[PDB]
């Protein structure tokens with residue numbers, strides 16, 4: 001219904017801060033960048049490793065499919081507002097081809113290790129450390145009035161040699177305003193919070209905390225993704241088989257949420273499972289009472305009862321990380 005933290009923060013700032021449709025970027029010259037290799041492609045972008053020929057810096061250039069002017073302004077304005085944020089990918093420049101005017105965003109380079117390889121070799125401390133660092137990015141963006149809305153392993157770049165983490169891909173991110181109805185077609189299937197799956201539009205920063213919880217679960221249990229739905233309906237079934245169906249119905253009742261009747265054929269009845277049920281010999285060294293307590297406080301149906309990024313960062317699970325830092 002309303003965020004527990006940072007709820008009014010955008011209303012307390014100048015309208016210019018959040019009125020991205022009115023934002024006028026300064027578009028530099030893309031000819032300063034030499035594209036070296038394609039790193040990947042999205043629905044509305046392609047990403048390249050590049051060199052800034054004026055200073056020989058290695059960077060990443062994200063070329064935007066320019067038919068989305070408002071969405072471009074949104075991502076640019078969000079990145080500008082987040083500049084300097086802890087563990088948020090640094091926007092170095094906003095550029096256009098000086099002839100075609102196709103826009104592109106220039107980011108700091110991170111030599112990331114692919115999450116499928118990485119998650120197989122993480123230690124207990126590593127998970128604590130990387131989760132803490134990711135939480136710093138989420139607390140920062142939430143404090144800046146912004147929901148990421150696409151938290152997932154692919155958007156969390158980790159250089160495991162230098163121990164650097166960056167939260168990337170702000171193209172689905174949005175400004176939080178109390179009582180605003182948001183599009184539920186955000187996030188990757190496996191990371192969608194139950195609010196999205198039940199078409200509850202008055203969500204908030206806590207959506208990102210569900211997604212973070214899914215990442216935590218996948219890391220400590222070594223099941224990636226943790227909730228592996230085959231479609232958006234089955235995704236909720238996978239969640240309910242862990243969190244329970246009675247607990248789902250209590251959430252829906254609290255918020256007066258209408259459940260699409262296609263769920264009637266597929267949800268079944270499921271008891272809440274104990275998190276200890278996911279422990280076995282291959283993951284036992286990554287699981288502790290602290291880890292399970294934290295996870296249990298993240299992967300809750302009720303978005304208002306999930307820990308905030310700060311509350312999570314504050315949990316005993318991270319004490320070993322704080323003591324080292």
Ligand SMILES: O=C(O)c1ccc(Nc2nc(-c3ccc4ccccc4c3)cs2)cc1O
Pocket residue numbers: 039040041042047060062089107109110111112157168169170
């Ligand atoms: O969008 C942004 O904010 C953004 C910022 C920095 C950044 N840097 C980097 N990306 C990659 C990478 C590697 C393999 C891939 C496979 C499929 C699809 C994409 C892929 C991206 C490595 S280093 C990428 C970004 O997308």
